[PDB]
Amino acid sequence: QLTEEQIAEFKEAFSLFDKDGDGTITTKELGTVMRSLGQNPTEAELQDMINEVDADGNGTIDFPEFLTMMARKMKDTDSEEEIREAFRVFDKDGNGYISAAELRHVMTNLGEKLTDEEVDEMIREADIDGDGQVNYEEFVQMMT
Numbered sequence: 001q002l003t004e005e006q007i008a009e010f011k012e013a014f015s016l017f018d019k020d021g022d023g024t025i026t027t028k029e030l031g032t033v034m035r036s037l038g039q040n041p042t043e044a045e046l047q048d049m050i051n052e053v054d055a056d057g058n059g060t061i062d063f064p065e066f067l068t069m070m071a072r073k074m075k076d077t078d079s080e081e082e083i084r085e086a087f088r089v090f091d092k093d094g095n096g097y098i099s100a101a102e103l104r105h106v107m108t109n110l111g112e113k114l115t116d117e118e119v120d121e122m123i124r125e126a127d128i129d130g131d132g133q134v135n136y137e138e139f140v141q142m143m144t
C-alpha cells in the first residue's frame with residue numbers, strides 16, 4: 001500500500017514542519033507553518049491539532065506519528081471545507097486552477113526552494129486531465 005517513495009515524500013514534508021531539525025514538531029513549529037499558509041490558529045487550537053496526532057502523549061509529533069496521520073485514509077465524507085480551505089491557499093488568484101507558479105509561491109513561503117522541474121513533476125502527478133494545472137476536483141482526489 002505505502003511505497004518507499006510516499007514514505008520519502010512524507011519525510012520531506014515532515015522537514016517542512018520540523019524547522020530546527022530536531023526530529024519533533026512543536027506547536028510553535030506548527031503555528032509558523034499554519035501562518036505561512038494564511039491560517040491563524042490560537043495556541044489552544046495549535047495544541048489541539050498536535051494532541052490529536054500525538055499518539056504517545058509526549059507533547060510533540062515525531063515522524064512515526066506524522067506518517068501515521070499523513071497516510072491515514074482521508075474519507076470523502078470528511079470535512080470538505082478543510083480541503084477547500086487547503087485549495088484556496090494554492091489558488092491565490094482564485095481562478096479555480098493551481099499553476100506551478102501558485103505552487104512555487106507557496107513552497108517559497110514555506111521556506112522551501114525547488115527546481116522548476118521539481119514543481120512541474122509535482123503538478124503532473126496531480127494533473128488528471130492533462131491541462132497542466134490542478135483544479136478542485138483534481139485537488140480533491142489527491143488530498144483524499
Ligand SMILES: CCCCOc1ccc([C@@H](C)NCCCNCCC(c2ccccc2)c2ccccc2)cc1OCCCC
Pocket residue numbers: 009010012013016033070071090098103107110112122123126134142143
Ligand atoms: C513540497 C514537498 C512536500 C510534500 O508534502 C506533502 C506530501 C504528501 C501529502 C499527502 C498527505 N497528500 C497526497 C499526495 C500529494 N503530495 C504532493 C502534492 C503537491 C501538490 C499540491 C497542489 C498542487 C499540485 C501538487 C503538494 C505540495 C506541497 C504540499 C502538499 C502537496 C501532503 C503533503 O503536505 C505537507 C505540506 C504542508 C504545508
Ligand SMILES: CCCCOc1ccc([C@@H](C)NCCCNCCC(c2ccccc2)c2ccccc2)cc1OCCCC
Pocket residue numbers: 017025030037039049050053061069070072074082085086089143144
Ligand atoms: C490551509 C490549510 C492547510 C491544510 O492542509 C492539509 C490538510 C489535510 C491534509 C490531509 C491529506 N492529511 C490528513 C488529515 C489531517 N491533517 C491535519 C494535520 C496537520 C498537522 C501536521 C503536523 C502536526 C500536527 C498536525 C497538518 C497541518 C498542515 C498541513 C498538513 C497537516 C493535507 C494537507 O496538506 C495539503 C495542503 C497544504 C499544503
Ligand SMILES: [Ca+2]
Pocket residue numbers: 017018019020021022023024025026029
Ligand atoms: Ca522541531
Ligand SMILES: [Ca+2]
Pocket residue numbers: 054055056057058059060061062065
Ligand atoms: Ca508524540
Ligand SMILES: [Ca+2]
Pocket residue numbers: 090091092093094095096097098099102
Ligand atoms: Ca490559480
Ligand SMILES: [Ca+2]
Pocket residue numbers: 127128129130131132133134135138
Ligand atoms: Ca488539470
